[PDB]
Design an enzyme around this catalytic site. Structure first.
Site, mmCIF file in Angstrom:
data_model
loop_
_atom_site.group_PDB
_atom_site.id
_atom_site.type_symbol
_atom_site.label_atom_id
_atom_site.label_comp_id
_atom_site.label_asym_id
_atom_site.label_seq_id
_atom_site.Cartn_x
_atom_site.Cartn_y
_atom_site.Cartn_z
ATOM 1 C CB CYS A 176 -0.866 0.002 1.269
ATOM 2 S SG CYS A 176 -2.012 1.383 1.434
ATOM 3 C CG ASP A 198 -1.982 4.521 3.225
ATOM 4 O OD1 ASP A 198 -2.725 5.054 2.390
ATOM 5 O OD2 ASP A 198 -2.216 3.384 3.727
ATOM 6 N NE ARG A 258 2.496 6.004 10.086
ATOM 7 C CZ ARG A 258 1.754 6.342 11.135
ATOM 8 N NH1 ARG A 258 1.623 5.499 12.157
ATOM 9 N NH2 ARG A 258 1.167 7.534 11.187
ATOM 10 C CG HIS A 282 -0.822 -0.827 6.171
ATOM 11 N ND1 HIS A 282 -0.829 0.431 6.724
ATOM 12 C CD2 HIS A 282 -1.375 -0.695 4.939
ATOM 13 C CE1 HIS A 282 -1.369 1.282 5.872
ATOM 14 N NE2 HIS A 282 -1.716 0.627 4.776
ATOM 15 C CB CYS A 336 -5.124 0.123 5.279
ATOM 16 S SG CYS A 336 -5.005 0.512 3.529
HETATM 17 ZN ZN ZN Z 1 -3.005 1.687 3.594
#
Ligand code: ZN
Ligand code: ZN
Ligand code: ZN
Ligand code: ZN
Lengths: 481, 481
Positions: free
Chosen positions: B66, B68, B70, B122, B125
């Site tokens: 994805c 976003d 980390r 994750h 999300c």
């Molecule tokens: Zn996400």
């Protein structure tokens, strides 16, 4: 160090640019001769034929159909050509993230202010059939995975089916219903409905043996919203207000949107009927279709049975969703002898799956001898490409026509009259799209496999219906190194 | 009659073309200063840092994650940068007909001969969250409809959930499982498996609070074929042999393929566990991830908690799936301060939904101040674009790089050395891709809305990790008329 394909196109561009915008002459192929024979016969039956065609009314219907369809949309609806905005792809899919579908939809809804959207499937659909009975199909199998999702989601209805034909019939019907759901769920239809815009989405199917449209259901306005089940009124509008971290609060357990319920109902109504023998609805769409059928049977009692016999198409026609003349008609061929793909501004984007799937299916599996890219003078999609609209789906799709403009200012600069200048852009767009189909792995493989495959470029003005040659390529290697 | 955007790029092209291939200098932005600080610190810790980086081993893993996220993929797997081929999009989707996904997959499988494919989701999300708690999102809502299909297909598991968090956790886990299904179902993985190629597809999730990968299941080889239930052995291979009219014979009622059964089993195993507390599997992926975690906790007991606090990203980074350096790393920023999109050859196709969805989400919703398009010297995707391969998904996607070559022969002709010539094409590709993001309705709306948004072009060679300026645009109207 240009490839042969590249050289070939430089040559074709010179040939085009030597003729004035809108005055290109018809070419060599028998399609120009056939197109001419048609024009003559039309003018002979009615001298006002093209004048009426060139001056028809805007379309009130958006019709999403299948590429292997033996009946023009306007015909089935008993409407004048051009009165129906048409999109065609493999198995009349309305995939959530398919931009070719989304851009035609947004253009129809926002630009054209279309009032009714119809998703039409047809019994015996080669796309639906391939999804069940063929594997290892390559590129197109990825497109067909969506039909597989329909079989998956509706196993209960399908396993119930008595035989292969009944099961195909039911899959085709369920496929249409699922696409209708997808159309209603788009941001485009949800936004329109939220703004109180009059817009119906209805499903329909027919068998070519009778040309009778059967009803799959109509949805008038159903919110597909479920955020009300997860966001407190205060947290509502979180993400749009810049806060993506607002909490998700389970307001209610298993909430379903208005759309979910609406579809549940339509599914119930479909499933309780016999596969392949659905009822027609009472809406004008069915009554008009019925008048049309009777009229056809009058002039020919076998009209539909013959329609159901027509041989596998030997041509793939890629045209614009504007479509003021059916492909088979313009080249004087029986309904169903041409496989058709239609999108906004007859685009053949390199990586467009809707375009690639139809191409592969036609070239590799049906083994068509010709692929025709057809543009049309005064194309609204092309005209729209030069405007200032900021619509997320249609205007990003149109950016491709902007590239054509930008890379052809040498020629475009010479023309200042708006009309002619648009028409020139429309011609070069056809040329550029032809180049793209020639450059696909699909056509290149066929060519170096020694398969007869001619890629023809064509354009016409509705005022005369005369096809004008934009070029033809019989074979050209696109390898540089 | 060029728009301001057009003029701006003609100016940027001149600036680029005045520097030799591979020698462009770092620019003005603080990202170049940060990139430099990083290079220095790296060289100071280990003078062989870039030599090793530039000479890593080819990736054995394809990781679909994805945007976003980390945590860099190679990090979670305790592997050197570049040892993992990465694709990133909104909510780690593996949409059947998404060419951005399909071209990265085919490149990884056919070009790279990748042995393992991982789909990683994750907890928390933003993409999955938006799908449940926000509506009227525009363009991106069409992408998010796929996550809605996951909620729809798995209502039984979801309604069971006790609260919003447990329900998001479970949707995220089911989303990963559904994408794994989609990866296995692609023509690419089905063909590979039919050819007996060693290729596993496995699902994994993690919460940034511990960085621990949990198992969603691994599929080693499962045919997704169902034609055996509908085609008699004689009629088998009908369509490929040119006969699309061969009959569909219901050999068996409710047959499901090997893949269907495999997924049913994995679903059963996921569902019986508590949402958000799945077990890790015993595969090396988990053991390596575990070593990595302990190592991190050693040097920092709060390592993961801090990771879980990092503020919303202020930059969207669009890079290549090759990725020999994590975006956040190259510009000296904490894991998770940069939103990332990766595809083959860092393409920003006008009508690409995977690209548009990430762009809109970052620019419109997260309100990032900069969008960086990053290319890299010796890019395999760009090198591949000049070859003769006829792979249906990857090679049609790459045709876009061919357009760049074709339209820039003036500059490219000056270079004959293969290496420099490729490297120049790579530079112009970045410039062309920047142009495309500047021309999107998304960036144009933000600009004339007075929103601070800088579009930066950048390129680097892994041998030195130094970012080279390809241009920057702070605002430029793209209206012609
Ligand atoms: Zn996400
Ligand atoms: Zn069909
Ligand atoms: Zn048009
Ligand atoms: Zn690369």
């Amino acid at each position: 160090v240009m490839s042969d394909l590249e050289k070939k196109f430089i040559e074709l561009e010179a040939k085009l640019v030597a003729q004035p915008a809108g005055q290109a002459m018809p070419g060599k192929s028998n399609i120009f001769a056939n197109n001419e024979a048609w024009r003559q016969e039309m003018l002979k039956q009615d001298p006002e034929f093209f004048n009426r065609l060139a001056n028809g009314q805007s379309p009130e219907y958006l019709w999403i159909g299948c590429a292997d369809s033996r009946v023009p949309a306007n015909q089935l609806l008993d409407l004048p050509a051009g009165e129906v905005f048409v999109h065609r792809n493999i198995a009349n899919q309305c995939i959530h993230s398919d931009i070719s579908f989304l851009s035609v939809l947004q253009y129809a809804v926002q630009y054209l202010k279309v009032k009714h959207i119809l998703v039409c499937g047809h019994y015996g659909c080669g796309g639906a059939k391939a999804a069940l009975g063929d594997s290892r199909l390559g590129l197109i199998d990825n497109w067909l995975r969506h039909i597989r999702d329909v079989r998956r989601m509706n196993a209960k209805y399908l396993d119930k089916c008595k035989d292969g034909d009944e099961e195909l019939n039911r899959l085709i019907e369920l496929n249409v219903l699922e696409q209708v759901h997808n159309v209603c769920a788009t941001s485009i239809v949800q936004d329109a409905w939220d703004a109180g815009q009059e817009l119906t989405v209805q499903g329909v199917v027919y068998g070519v043996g009778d040309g009778k449209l059967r009803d799959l259901g109509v949805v008038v306005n159903s919110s597909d919203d479920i955020s009300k089940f997860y966001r407190t009124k205060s947290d509502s509008g979180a993400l749009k207000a810049g806060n993506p971290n607002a909490p998700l609060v389970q307001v209610t357990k298993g909430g379903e949107s208005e759309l979910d319920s609406t579809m549940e109902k339509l599914t119930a109504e479909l499933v309780q009927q016999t596969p392949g023998k659905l009822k027609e609805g009472a809406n004008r769409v069915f009554v008009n279709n019925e008048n049309w059928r009777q009229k056809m049977l009058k002039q020919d009692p076998q009209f539909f049975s013959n329609l159901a016999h027509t041989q596998t198409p030997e041509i793939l026609w890629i045209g614009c969703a504007d479509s003021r003349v059916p492909a088979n008609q313009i080249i004087n061929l029986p309904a169903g002898e041409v496989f058709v793909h239609r999108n906004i501004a007859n685009q053949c984007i390199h990586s467009d799956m809707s375009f690639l799937s139809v191409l592969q299916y036609a070239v590799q599996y049906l083994k068509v001898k010709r692929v025709v890219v057809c543009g049309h003078y005064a194309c609204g999609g092309c005209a729209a490409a030069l405007g200032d609209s900021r619509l997320g789906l249609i205007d990003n799709w149109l950016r491709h026509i902007r590239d054509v403009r930008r890379h052809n200012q040498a020629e475009l600069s010479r023309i200042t009259d708006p009309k002619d200048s648009l028409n020139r852009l429309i011609e070069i767009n056809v040329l550029e799209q032809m180049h793209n189909v020639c450059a696909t792995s699909i056509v290149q493989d066929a060519w170096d496999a020694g398969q007869e495959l001619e890629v023809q470029g064509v354009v016409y003005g509705v005022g005369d219906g005369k096809l004008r040659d934009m070029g033809v390529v019989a074979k050209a290697n696109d390898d540089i190194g």
